[PDB]
Symmetry: D2
Subunit: 391 residues, 4 copies
């Protein structure tokens, strides 16, 4: 059973996806935001997220806009759901065909910023703490079409303005850049968790910026999602996370969390939950950015919403048991996993004492050490037996 302390959130665009893919028409009718709010509260979610255009149809008058916001607000009210994050749609409308913030067309860039400032206003009114930015159209199909250097300057220029505004209006938002390697552009700028973290480090107020990595995004490049998250945590830039499934380098599948690379889903939950001193290593929302398969109807939709929560709770339970097992604890010792936490250098030791240590080189028996095994297969087999519920 899911509790509000689990912090499961879903985007309105997930359960609301009508299943219009690149090769066919929608197979499901539109979902009413209010209904979405009641259904999600009912399956155990603690919050909902949305793109401006998901809640208010692009081009709605203020009267309409205002009315929609009012009803949405009531729904949250009655159900107790919160809005931990909001985002802006800078990919759908034809105007953004070459990007929002990095469109070659200057007028588009000015417009994309305005669209976002507005969404920032709504987010602050609803109490959202994080603004996620997915630059889906920032990038190119052809190398000569985009000056990457100029693009990074313009991406930077726009973000610095957004931080200025938030800080000045006192919104207290955190900004999370979401990396993606491709799709819809041939290549997207800031293709991985690594490129997004390096870019953020160059902004004016870098402490307000982090990343929102997505499981399938990193897997589209055949990268290890867990190892990437571990790196993000080391830098302290994991501001939010999108969970879903994918089967390697192919179109973005957005399957239910754990329905793609199951072994990596397990090590991920282990990383987020079996944090230092019992406690999770991560504290924000556990947000599912997935899509109910095109072959399903609304029954299938609610089922898939529950499957995400279910997968996460079953994995947590097995990650917990894994760590708690004295036999795993013995295998961990033999493989020396914790020995990596001991500094390489003795306290106060520098280059000169190290050069003076004959045991670190001149008298070191590399051949003898090179022959001892690490016992890694065995430790790995123990983990899978826990995942399989065989231990």
């Amino acid at each position: 059973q899911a509790t509000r302390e689990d912090k499961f959130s879903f985007g309105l665009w997930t359960v609301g996806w009508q299943a219009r893919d690149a090769f066919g028409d929608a197979t499901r009718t539109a979902l009413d935001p209010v209904e979405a709010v009641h259904k999600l509260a009912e399956i155990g979610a603690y919050g909902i997220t949305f793109h401006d255009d998901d809640l208010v149809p692009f081009g709605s008058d203020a009267q309409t806009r205002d009315g929609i916001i009012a009803g949405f607000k009531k729904a949250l009210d009655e159900t107790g759901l919160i809005v931990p994050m909001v985002t802006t749609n800078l990919f759908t409308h034809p105007v953004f065909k070459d990007g929002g913030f990095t469109s070659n067309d200057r007028s588009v860039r000015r417009y994309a910023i305005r669209k976002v400032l507005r969404q920032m206003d709504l987010g602050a009114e609803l109490g959202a703490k994080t603004l996620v930015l997915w630059g889906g159209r920032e990038g190119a199909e052809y190398d000569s079409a985009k000056d990457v250097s100029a693009a990074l300057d313009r991406y930077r220029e726009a973000l610095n303005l957004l931080a200025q505004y938030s800080e000045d209006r006192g919104y207290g938002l955190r900004f999370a850049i979401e990396p993606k390697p491709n799709e819809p552009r041939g290549d997207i700028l800031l293709p991985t968790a690594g490129h997004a973290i390096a870019f953020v480090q160059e902004l004016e107020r870098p402490e307000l910026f982090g990343i929102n990595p997505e499981t399938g995004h990193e897997q589209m490049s055949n990268l290890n999602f867990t190892q990437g998250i571990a790196q993000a945590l080391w830098h302290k830039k994991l501001f939010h996370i999108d969970l879903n499934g994918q089967h390697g380098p192919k179109f973005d599948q957005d399957l239910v969390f754990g329905h793609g690379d199951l072994l990596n889903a397990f090590s991920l939950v282990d990383l987020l939950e079996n944090g230092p001193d019992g406690a999770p290593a991560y504290d924000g929302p556990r947000h599912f950015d997935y899509k109910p398969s095109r072959t399903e109807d609304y029954d299938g939709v609610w089922e898939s919403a529950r499957a995400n929560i279910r997968m996460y709770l079953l994995l947590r339970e097995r990650a917990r048991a894994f760590r708690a097992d004295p036999e795993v604890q013995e295998a961990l010792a033999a493989s020396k996993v914790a020995e990596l936490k001991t500094p390489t250098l003795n306290p106060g030791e520098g280059y000169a004492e190290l050069l003076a240590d004959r045991s670190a080189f001149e008298d070191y028996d590399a051949d003898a050490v090179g022959a001892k095994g690490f016992g890694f297969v065995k430790l790995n087999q123990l983990a899978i037996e826990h995942l399989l519920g065989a231990r």
Copy 2:
């Protein structure tokens, strides 16, 4: 090829005996003095090497000393320099779980000593860059390696190297070399971005950059030219390894331009049709490739020349591309240069932007969305330049 082109090769490239994961070596060992002489002849301006490529692992000092002296004499006679040096922290069994990040504390200590030793030699030969390729840093299984602790230990080791270099006045720059996998299932710092992000966290970051390799980024299906552009933006492109690859599969290390030719073209354009008229990058054009296993030493020398030849041919077409009036017109129609103009007018902030009805309230997005960028046409002129069709 001029010394000014700065083409360099690793001793281990032309010297690769072609022993692969599935077969025996098909070529005999290449003598280092010989390699220096042959590389000087093909137009290389410099040579690089791992410690163990030059001095066999475990050579006594007399031997080691002898080899260096001969090596230095060959350098002397041909006029070749040593722009970069590196350390083999991957071959010997002791490094099976990594050098700086091995779970075993004693291997970590030995790894640092092995590198300090190589720094002294590099300093001695005049090398300016120390490249570090952490090929054994990573894992096959997620529960076997604590990534957070591994980054601490990677960081602890690099801080010490810089300390030493700086106290001794060596003036070295450090370039981390990213690779997603092979030999490990997953290697730490898998892409150029992960490596740049990491370097920003060291104690003397100004001393650290990256050494991206064409093929390593392509093993993940990333755009090499686009990652180099970001590296240049951060000013962390300290060195570059050029070669060819055909997408995600084992590391092929083909001659530069024999893998993704279109990306090879846009890369030379980026590196050479720099800022002014000038190159955007001024370091060595280093070829980290392998002569195919099917070749003998005639093939080896041919493959070395092919690297230089691909670069010069692409350079020539990149220049011609940029000088074409038809290309200038296509660039003008695709608004490439408009991206260089700030989004905001000088002195404009969020308050002035919010006051501009034309940036939103009266913005005709429908009308803007209907005009084409003409990117296909621009792409077509680039390719025609590549094929010498214009």
Copy 3:
């Protein structure tokens, strides 16, 4: 250069007609009028046009309308001299085909799918098409337990056997080309590569009537060597048609202009198709472009991209011929022993008994001396590329 009708460049109506609605955004271009399409293509040099039933006649058109459209379309063909070399059927767009056409778990959908194809065969026969292309875009699954692959192959076969029967009985004279694709839109599509599709075809009742229609980008989506797969297809005599386009390895289907993805492989492919045995092309069917003008483009970009497909093919053709005609290349081919592979391993009349008696093939063979000689493959590759760059 200039395209002639003998080059046989053809384009799908859905190619230049793609409005650019992708998985993440709305259409950026208005609808293309088919008569206009016929006219525009004639002008850029195409010798034929192809289409899906639903590209020409809107799904759910009354008989009157349908007839109306066809007759206008036939006039334009008439007027311009374009032919219809191939026709295909859309079994992927309408929601009813969400689990497939021919292999839908739902039996009623399979029956409907067959009927929809029968109808296109008739229109096809009437327009003079020689090939029926079948792209089973929704045949596959997202989850392994959801599709019995064996049963699906039975049903796939069952539907194809019937179409062959019909065509033969009506005297249509069609050939059928199955088009493989590894994924998108299904997580996994059945008959994922050219290989799997050829193996399948061999199991049909009148296999001589079935071949494949491989697409450059589909094979590359799995990182396979397109040229090598087409060489195998030709070896089997199953290349009934070909879809040309570009792709940048394993990622979503990009459908770029031919030669705008893997340029080196586009070169070797043109070389294989044209620098066939007896000087002549190894393949004589349509050179069909199944690509999409980028979403960033307007109608000018659209006609520009259509012409680019042709320009790319012709520029590569020209370099492939220069390559083969170069004496230095001839010398490199000889040192690489490329043609020695065409001489049989055994001397005429030799069998295992005579091979076993040859001490020189084993007992006295010096593997070590043979293993030391290089094949000169790098030099040969370098010469190919210099020809491609127009540097020679």
Copy 4:
């Protein structure tokens, strides 16, 4: 659980015997004695051992040496009761094979390759092996112009026809299994996927004697669905043998323990093999592990890893069994209409004429209403994973 001889788990001598010399480093383990390997495998529950000629008998051993080795080997087999179900030949290590064995551009290498194999068939037939596996690891190219594929397929076929001839004439009763691989060690390998190999086998003189030996990670190196290709191999009845291991998508060949790569695909694979044609195994040959103990391990890790392969197979078999015996899973299958795919699309005796006559198949078909019904695939996939997780 415990492995029985009835489980038919086999290992190649080269698996537990891999010294861990990779492309970037020296071996981390000392050589394993073949007799010791027989004893150790017998002890963990294997029923058979397989080997390449060069794994048992060092390349170039004189006849007395070779004979002594074989004799000691046979004694160990005798004493442990292990059998030799398949043998193979190394046509990839020696420098002479740098451009392939059967398809080297060099004619003399092709003659030597055939003799190396014939000699191995003799030893196999004497040890009682029933299958000869052929992995053409060096057949291919790094550059397109270096290899004529058509000529290569002719030479490949030429060699294989001779081998069938010899076997049939000697009464060896061997079956031949070609093992596909997309790349590594060559940039591109001929017959890259199970599909390509099946299509090729179909062109031999005696196709009934030929099938495939597909490997889990080889198909995953192309990001293909292994279970789905296995399903197709079974449909063609060409699954002669199988190599089980683990891989993480497109990268170098990892050869991890079976189930340590794509766990979900491993699960549906065991479901297909054991519960295939309903309840009964769809495959009865060896369950062969072609894996490598990680380079980080010592001999204790090697035996642990050999045991992990068997454990993984048995755990998944148990979960696959429970999955199918679950009345809720059955109900989901019914709802998803999985079995309805097994019912012919056409009625008994119905032809195109009758089909064309059925208005319910088209004229009166409500596509729109059918298109709106959900298949319930997500729910079915969730039950499958809950079985795998032991949560049900």
